């Protein structure tokens, strides 16, 4: 299956049929390029990787010349060095003199490569001068200066292939070729601020902020995103108190160099409406306070209200650390109340699928396993909105192989092609009984995939019954080597809270609390908390959740703490603290550790390594980082998840609603950022610019 | 001898926030804060030379 050949005297063995640029990458030979990318289609536009090949008259393009046996490849021929100087010189003749004002100062691919191979001198000194090709508006997220473009087709190859937004294009012939929409219409895709780290020159860049810091000034920091459930890898760039940008670090399984839009442009909300001091409510107006003032106010109101048990509600929220949840849960259970719930509506009960047997609430086939999938169906979700990188995975699989989608829920617009099935659990059961007991039973590697927007529903258990009974009946969806019951989450914490056991009991759902704890917890309603309750908020910026509070406590956001986070797949991953918490914010678990001292609870740890050991005691797949383990208990877990909700609840005819009303405004940072606040109204698809037609 | 930020004829500040003088200084005297206005042109909100540590190269 492999082929041995020679590059630069080295010998190298690569799989048959590959490109020659992959053999040059494998052997260690540096070959320059402009329009080749590891995740995109092959074009031969840019003409840089010309290479000397024996038995060839001309130098061939190494990105699209396929690998043949007995191959002798030379890269240091004087003809090749002449070729690279020639092509570089051709590239640099009406490219404009913009490097003092360009974005890609120290990060320009064309600029670094005009040193290793480019000519020293430039002859373009013609009178009539440069081409102009005046630019055009795209959207409020992508700054566009098309004079600096070199026409590498990489932006339009991306927006066609993986993003699924075919609006971009190349209109013209010869020198009057332009790239982009020429209706003056709006590029909408849910992963759209991704074309700017893809363009090798500074033509498509950031609109919401002008660049204020040149990339030699920046300090790079390798952290995890917590805004979405995928837990994709980012790269925080900081000048030192402020955070400039995030950029996808590459990961083989989870995100493959692509990052979400909401992941990227919500560093704006990281510096605009934060909490820098504790506040105490006087009555219709807060005042800011001494730290001791607020933290003795909390103890004095605990002694005044005196919740003896099942009256200290402790709700967490969306983007919170595992260690802060461990601190909160320890403080509640040594307090004497496991009224320990999550933020979602219908969060006051157990979420109708087991905290037991981790494969109940995880994404059980791996994220890599979608590439191996055959015919999958989604229930109650829109993967275009929730986990937008997952849709790039779905469309990549559906385009590379032969797949079959059908959908149960609201009528979604995917990039890919769904089949509609219905808006009812009766339509669900009819679809699972009618024609997909042939399709999912026939398929080698299917998977059934579930939103967390059905755990929202109070009729969830009857919706788990049909699907768990089908998985237990069908032996192709559930066997030895892979599990195919799969769910999604919407948070970085709700897939890791259930690792701890962060759930209320059946007794805890019945009482009304006297002292409510908000930890994050941004989507609470005015009806969800009582009127007499002591409602202390702990978060990192001001929100609806902080508006109800009697005491707010400033916490550190995800940038400012080294935290553990668990995705839907089950990967435990650490973030790195890029900067300190600004003004008077502190780390999240240490605040609980000190409020415990003013109560009667002495938490047994005071050090971060002791937090790591206690965190191992809850479950040791959380001190083991970025490993995925299989489960031998998936067969038992589907039956144990089936037995519980059998007959407990009747399936009503409530139609399957959309899980989030907006993508761009959730999770307590995107509400504060003006980038999202104008990007929600610019992409409303009411206007003529977002729509493909008319 | 002592520094000066020049101007254009017809009155214009001429420092385009291009950040080269900060990246070369062998004693790190320059400190520049750069911000862009609505116009699309580039200038400096805060320009700064510490003359205790400028070395006159």
């Amino acid at each position: 299956a492999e082929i041995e050949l020679t590059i630069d005297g080295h010998k190298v063995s690569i799989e048959a049929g590959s490109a020659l640029i992959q053999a040059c990458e494998k052997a260690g030979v540096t070959v320059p390029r402009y329009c080749y990318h590891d995740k995109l289609a092959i074009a031969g536009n840019c003409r840089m990787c010309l290479v000397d090949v024996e038995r060839a008259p001309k130098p061939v393009a190494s990105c699209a010349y396929p690998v043949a046996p007995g191959m002798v490849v030379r890269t240091d021929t004087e003809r090749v060095k002449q070729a690279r100087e020639n092509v570089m010189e051709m590239m640099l003749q009406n490219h404009p003199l913009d490097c003092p004002v360009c974005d890609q100062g120290g990060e320009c691919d064309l600029q670094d490569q005009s040193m290793r191979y480019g000519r020293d001198r430039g002859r373009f000194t013609e009178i009539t001068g440069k081409r102009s090709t005046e630019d055009k508006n795209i959207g409020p997220l992508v700054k566009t200066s098309m004079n600096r473009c070199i026409h590498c087709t990489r932006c339009v190859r991306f927006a066609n292939d993986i993003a699924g937004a075919p609006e971009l294009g190349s209109s013209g012939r010869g020198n009057d070729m332009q790239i982009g929409t020429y209706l003056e219409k709006n590029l909408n895709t849910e992963l759209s601020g991704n074309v700017i780290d893809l363009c090798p020159v500074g033509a498509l860049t950031n609109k919401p902020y002008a660049f204020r810091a040149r990339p030699w000034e920046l300090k790079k920091t390798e952290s995890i995103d917590v805004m979405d459930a995928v837990g994709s890898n980012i790269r925080i760039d900081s000048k030192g108190v402020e955070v400039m940008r995030v950029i996808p670090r590459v990961h083989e399984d989870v995100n493959e160099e692509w990052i979400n839009d909401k992941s990227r442009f919500a560093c704006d909300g990281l510096k605009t409406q934060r909490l820098t001091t504790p506040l105490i409510r006087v009555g219709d107006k807060f005042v800011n306070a001494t730290w001791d003032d607020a933290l003795s106010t909390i103890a004095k109101a605990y002694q005044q209200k005196a919740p003896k048990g099942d009256e200290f509600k402790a709700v967490a929220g969306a983007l919170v650390e595992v260690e802060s949840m461990v601190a909160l849960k320890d403080m509640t259970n040594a307090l004497g109340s496991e009224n320990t719930t999550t933020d979602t509506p219908n969060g006051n009960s157990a979420p109708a699928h087991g905290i037991t047997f981790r494969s109940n609430y995880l994404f059980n086939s791996s994220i890599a396993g979608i590439e191996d999938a055959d015919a999958i169906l989604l229930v109650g979700t829109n993967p275009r909105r929730e986990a937008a990188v997952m849709n790039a995975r779905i469309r990549k699989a559906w385009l590379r192989q032969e797949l079959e989608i059908a959908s149960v829920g609201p009528t979604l617009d995917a990039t890919f092609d769904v089949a509609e099935l219905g808006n009812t659990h009766a339509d669900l059961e009819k679809a699972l009984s009618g024609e997909f007991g042939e399709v999912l039973k026939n398929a080698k590697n299917p998977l059934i995939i579930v939103g967390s927007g059905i755990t929202d529903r109070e009729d969830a258990g009857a919706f788990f019954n049909t699907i768990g009974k089908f998985v237990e009946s069908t032996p192709s969806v559930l066997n030895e080597n892979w599990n195919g019951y799969n769910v999604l989450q919407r948070s970085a914490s709700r897939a890791g809270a259930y690792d701890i056991g962060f759930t209320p009991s059946d007794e805890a759902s019945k009482t009304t609390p006297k002292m409510v704890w908000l930890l994050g917890a941004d989507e609470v309603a005015a009806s969800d908390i009582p009127a007499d309750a002591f409602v202390v908020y702990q978060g990192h910026n001001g929100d609806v959740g902080a508006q109800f509070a009697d005491v707010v406590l400033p916490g550190a956001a995800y940038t400012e703490k080294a935290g553990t986070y668990v995705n839907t797949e089950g990967r435990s991953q650490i973030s790195r603290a890029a900067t300190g918490p600004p003004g008077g914010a502190r780390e999240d678990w240490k605040i609980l550790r000190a409020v415990s001292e003013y109560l009667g609870v002495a938490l047994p740890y005071e050090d971060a390594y002791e937090v790591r050991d206690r965190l191992a005691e809850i479950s040791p797949s959380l001190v083991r980082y970025d490993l995925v383990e299989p489960t031998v208990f998936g067969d038992v877990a589907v039956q144990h998840s089936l037995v519980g909700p059998n007959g407990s609840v009747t399936p009503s005819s409530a139609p399957l609603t959309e899980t989030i009303e907006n993508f761009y405004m959730t999770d307590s940072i995107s509400r504060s950022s003006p980038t999202m606040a104008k990007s929600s109204i610019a992409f409303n698809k009411d206007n003529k610019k977002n729509q493909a037609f008319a | 001898g002592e520094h000066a930020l020049r101007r254009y004829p017809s009155g214009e500040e001429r420092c385009i926030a291009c950040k080269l003088c900060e990246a070369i200084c062998p004693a790190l005297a320059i400190t520049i804060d750069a911000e862009e206005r609505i116009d699309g042109s580039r200038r400096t909100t805060k320009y700064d030379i510490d003359m205790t540590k400028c070395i006159y190269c």
Partner: peptide, 13 residues
Amino acid sequence: KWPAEWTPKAAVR
């Protein structure tokens, strides 16, 4: 020609 702290709003009980 050419980390702002959140403003305090306590809502109704």
